[model samples]
Target chain A: MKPVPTYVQDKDESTLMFSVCSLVRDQAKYDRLLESFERFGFTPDKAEFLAADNREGNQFHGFSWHKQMLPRCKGRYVIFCHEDVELVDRGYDDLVAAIEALEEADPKWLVAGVAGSPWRPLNHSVTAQALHISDVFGNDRRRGNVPCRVESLDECFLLMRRLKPVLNSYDMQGFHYYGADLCLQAEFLGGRAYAIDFHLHHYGRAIADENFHRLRQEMAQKYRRWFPGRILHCVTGRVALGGGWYEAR
Target chain B: MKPVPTYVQDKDESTLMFSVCSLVRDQAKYDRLLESFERFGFTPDKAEFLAADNREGNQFHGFSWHKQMLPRCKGRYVIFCHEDVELVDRGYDDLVAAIEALEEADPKWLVAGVAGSPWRPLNHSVTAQALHISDVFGNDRRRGNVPCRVESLDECFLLMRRLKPVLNSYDMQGFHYYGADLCLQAEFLGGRAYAIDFHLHHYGRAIADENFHRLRQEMAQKYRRWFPGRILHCVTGRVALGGGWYEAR
Candidate 1:
């Protein structure tokens, strides 16, 4: 996919706030993403996409490539998407809707969405019950969007750009699947993030039992102590892309 | 994605004797295979791609869920393509080419091509070579119309289906990556199997490193001692299904 230019010296720009980036492990999903962008009417001239592959044995560091690459981005906006995602038929529309609502609802516009979340009883924490990942579902959250400084935004469809002073900052400490996305998004949003459960059809299940052992190892070896309880530690640190989201509620 | 039943069933009608099977880990690559099949003008209907995957993980004796699923095939022709493969534009013409060549050249029609192989040079006594598996360029000998029973085909794009008379009789002693495809194809062909340089893109590299570890451990834990480097042991014993591919070879 072509990287949409952020600025053109000669062209008069209205608003350029986001560029799209995707993390891919292989070409299969990468090909599909290209197809999806084609469906979204993205032409080589109209836009370009940047892909990050976590396939590297040193993928923890591979993602860090973005910290450098994105800083060099010419766009006012940047959106990071994992390979297993597709922008909807109305992807652009839905994105604008959520962003506008988030801005109106909260002074901070760190609103994000995810592909899937569990359906557990709500806690006083204002978080929905953790849903079984298999039984998970997410929404575009098209209804009046809520203010977001979300703890986790599904990297599948994270939409934000490095417009502010914070820039795209992330801690590239975890391996293939871990806290890097959250940390980076949080870093960009000044540590304030939120989400609207926007459904981004995810072909792969992001979580499995192995994630526990993986997270534990990453926590002990790479990440810092973040919360109490395996569940809390798991969920809290699991998602950090402040504009995080889940397709499921 | 669903299995290509017509291809699977049509191959069953072949006079071949042994069955070839592949294993899978990544879903994205699996999806790409389906798309490749579709691109090749095949419609996938009711096929048991995950005959064993649906069952208990450890119930298959020594063979993990990956191999246990292979023996259930009713087809006289069985080429196991462990999921996680990508195809270039070569299509099935290459396989058909190899098959015709095998029939014309070898009389026994015992040869298969390699689309994707490990990066290392072939070290084993068997004729399996590291059939060029780069994300960039390749000859994709792993796929297409090669002899069903020849060569240690990369399970990624294996092209055999019951080329043996005894039917699903190969041993798969949980021989992960390195040997399972090699041993079964070698025994089925009664000897050496080689691959062309044509490239059928494979995306399994996403999990290649992990796959190496997992396969090494799983194979070593179960069959390393029995087979040494021979993959046929998995089929002969610990593998839930009885293996006869070796004897036929």
Candidate 2:
């Protein structure tokens, strides 16, 4: 069971079309996120801002924390993002239009994101502005304005529509494979996840922490159990089936 | 069996008190080492400088590379140091004095270094300038001027007297446990390793590559096999136990 939230506030419920949510530890980075959001016209009155501060400590499990925070998002769409991102593209207005267009084109579209790939092998169109800054170097992987469907999106920016509650596996602990897990959940519920046209500067990289391998293995096991007998098809790394994951078959 | 040396130069046999050798890949870092050496009164004519370039690829094993490089040192003492370190301390005159003093105090002293600790728990002084500079942060950990015996020393800068050959464990492969292994070798051969009163700007920190864990595990296994039956006294993380591994009670 998810714990009750005591530190959630609604700035303006009446004008809440979308709620920008993030689990943050560094206050400075969170401020940067808000600052970047303001650059693209996501003002306090237009969009609701929800944040879970983990700067004190790891209070709750990743998925469970998300579960608690989800109910507090009184908006049609929730922009769940990482604090280290800078919104390069203007406003949530374009994002809303994109989601609405995607939903209209395919009613089963559940989640949309800025960056993700549909498995490997012949997997193409892993979308992102791909702006990364590290101590060693920087990277700018802006692949034009191409939006495509994908199996998994990186948890940096997961924009979810208010259709159904996001599934959190009972055994999921820590914040490791939530992106992959969410994508799989949508697939299991007969919906789709996608990579979209929105762009953000990701100050982080694909570096894993200590519990990375542990949670990843657990996620794999949970998914295998969820979809019994089906093999994790070749070319595709983790997802149970290969052919079903990639779009435009 | 270790490989024979083919790329060593004896520039000057006379006035050769110390031979500074390092395994290097980056030319810029190697240049830094030379520049720092000059800052501390270690000229090319004063000491023998040897470097094994691995920029093309990792050719020889870690221990093997050291083995090949060791025979080329035509000096009374050999200083095996990393390329990223900037020697901030003035002159090896003080270092030579320290070694001489240590040797006079205890004839069995084999190795000396700037940083390392005995084992934690009741572990005595874990000494280092604690100096480090990455592209991000810089640290300075100056603990006054004190030199003491230590069980292990970081491989950043290890100064060796004209004692026995530096042991390169045949089983050890990558560049992980060579420092601890060398210290243990000295201890097993009825000698001691010490942290001396010297300082350097280590432009690197406690970062490891993928082979870190693999090589560490291999080190543990090799050491375990070397000293059968005896429990590795807790707090002394990796190196296997010797009869006189602990300090005087």
Candidate 3:
């Protein structure tokens, strides 16, 4: 049985559901997602796409609308993807299966098709969570849960049960695109987020040229505020730009 | 007429006359430097190349050797350079010439080849001295005669006359690698030093992998310690890291 598309009126529910999320400044890529859906036997249900353009009117480093939009979604399982993602034949099916498996195992499990998010490393391939610095200091994968305090969500295409409470709770203050999602993701099923092989092709690095520096600065500010010892750790030569810790989303 | 390479039978002067300054812990490149020099022109007469290796045991960083070997130099001028530099031609004659030209113009002026270093941008280069924050910041070439504080030296490949009182005056306390040289250059000139392009053919970067990060971190730390609000300048989107400041170097 296929899931119904959310937030859209009168579209045929027979087609597969897809939602494209992106934060762009000027050089935003649009046609790629439309092309992906066409390949996947899905058509743009414009209403359901959320078009959560997080662009700050004139800049790309503002709040993320995708994280804010995901919970308000009206479907049982929503396919949240970035604008740059291209879908393989099995991408959609495998993604749906993973989400289905996760939902079946735990009500609060959030299934993410992508792994190695750029900012912080708090993925499920995760066995347990450790709330200490040295636990994940070297960016070693075998370590226990990385205690990054859930800065934001990696909705590089997050699949989840659209619950309104989770949506309202995800509304964070001060930051436009910093920590709200990661914090919410942690509260979900006590860190049962999955990083599976099933993939959604990402399609929007073009926006990075504008947003990269601002985000770097903003995150540095937020990190200093939230994770106090980070700059010192980096300054004292503790971390490297290697490993999953330096993953470029 | 040439300055005699006086082999003072005095053991201390023989050992101290000319020494190679190297930040150890990186053996491969150091070994390669030995090989590169041997292959090219590893002459011992014109000037002895003594390896001031900093990697005996727990050396905190690279620049530690400058202080460690500062007392041993008996040479008239100390020419500090890194391994990235390749000697396309021989001798330090141009360095002496530049210093002489500057000295001829003014007696109080300190002579050094590329005092603002790397020898590329002289008039409008971003030059600074070592401080927690800068008391003066400028790219103006006209800002000459300003007492060179640890707030304005380029610190790349510096060539300066060896003066005992000036050496005694420099605060060689906790600095390592990057910033100390600039501080020394600035303070040495009593604030009126200039850069001439002839002596150095800087090949741009250094050998180690963590070199850049460590350098920037040390630099930022120096700024934080000497100039308190400087970190604020880097963090508050003022420095233009093009990404969020936290993600910035």
Candidate 4:
């Protein structure tokens, strides 16, 4: 039997600029994340800190938890970040700057994040670096100047213009491909996903476990028709055709 | 007055091959990390799990806690890792293989870990990549083949050959530059550090805080006598001299 997702809400009913949401398993780490948020200008007036505390044993996986938290957010924008993350570089001000710039640059831009691989439309690889991280992988100089169109955004720090039900209407199971699926889902709804230049630090390791690899396979199979012979590259791994990707076997 | 470090010992003090030590702030996460350890061939006989539980808050920082736990370990080799890390690649077998190979190759090698930056011996940057991660930064193909000589190891998964006091007799203060300092300390004791091919998923953001940058400055200053003008690069950041290399400033 499939487990149903449960919803939790923040009591403040006032609409705000952003709701920074996370599924927190540890309180101290969450407190540290909160400290980082406060340090980086994500104050009460700008963004609301929304979290699903899973300190106890009986807690839902990240996918279900995030889905449950989506509708409860009363904000113009919704942010999904890991509790272990630190805002090491630019912050709320840069976030708004990039958001406004992206809105002016692309009418269909609906979501953005700090890290992801940029697609090359359909053919050759994009020579220009699609994504730049001011995080751990970053050595100090790399910077993503604009919002580059991407096939997926990293789940570590995700943001969406919540003018409508994006994650609420999202039809995904498991914790792995929520970000990837959200991007395509937005695209299906006449919008596009992007990798924006909002600099932040992500503290989650990309796992290649049984769940991760299998989900990659499913994603490639599920979205094969729209992207025939084209692989949608993500930060963690790649989504591509199963067999005979222009076949040598 | 500085707070004295506390030592929490694991019962059944029978010596083992490896003692995997961590400063655990969350039990559930520690349990998950334990499950991963079991999954990856670090069973009871081969290794013992040693941890400093800081769940109820009043606990020493990582540096102090790790330093305290050094003597209680009954293993020939002591592994210092985070509770959030997951073992993703080769297990105990590969670890032993690498250890043996490194012993045969370099006599003075005392510590090894999964990630680090290679040094160029005071003149230029070494062309051959010094480190490889089978964890998050790794794609499907990247492999470290052999143990590579490195300037400093990443603190996420550090393993040292516990012939004598490597961490116990260390004279470091802050929580940041412990790994870099340990590497040089090993060198000071007629031993050296190496980056091994054992891959593990490190779920930590490299924080460039006031402590981190300042520690880098301290390490560069402290080790300046040995290498003179050489930059001892670390995976998180570099330890370099303040002035220009023979003044181009």
CA RMSD, predictions in order: 21.9, 25.2, 27.2, 24.1
Query: Against the true structure, what is model 4's DockQ?
Result: 0.01
Worst 10 residues of 2 chain B by lDDT: B1-10
Residue B69's lDDT within candidate 3 is 39
Better of 1 and 2 by TM-score: 2
Question: lDDT tens digits, residues B1-249, model 4?
Answer: 111111112122346788888767777777778888778888877887777666666364544554345544567778887778877676888888888888899866877877766635443454233555544555433433437777677777788754333432123346676776667555543467888777666664555568777667766665553355566676665555543243355
Which candidate comes out best when scored by TM-score? 4
lDDT of 3 by residue, A174-236 (tens): 222332333322332133344444534443332344454454454444333324333211111
Per-residue CA lDDT of model 2 for B149-184, tens digit only, reads: 666676778877532443544445677666766766
Which tens-of-lDDT digit does each residue in B177-232 have in candidate 3? Answer: 33333433333223333444442233333245555554455455433332333321
What is the DockQ (computed on Cα atoms) for candidate 3? 0.01
Taken over the whole model, the C-alpha lDDT of each candidate is: 0.39, 0.58, 0.36, 0.63
The DockQ for candidate 2, computed on C-alphas, is 0.01
Q: Clashes in model 2: which pairs? A: none
lDDT of 3 at A201: 47
Worst 10 residues of 1 chain A by lDDT: A1-10
Candidate 4 TM-score to native: 0.44
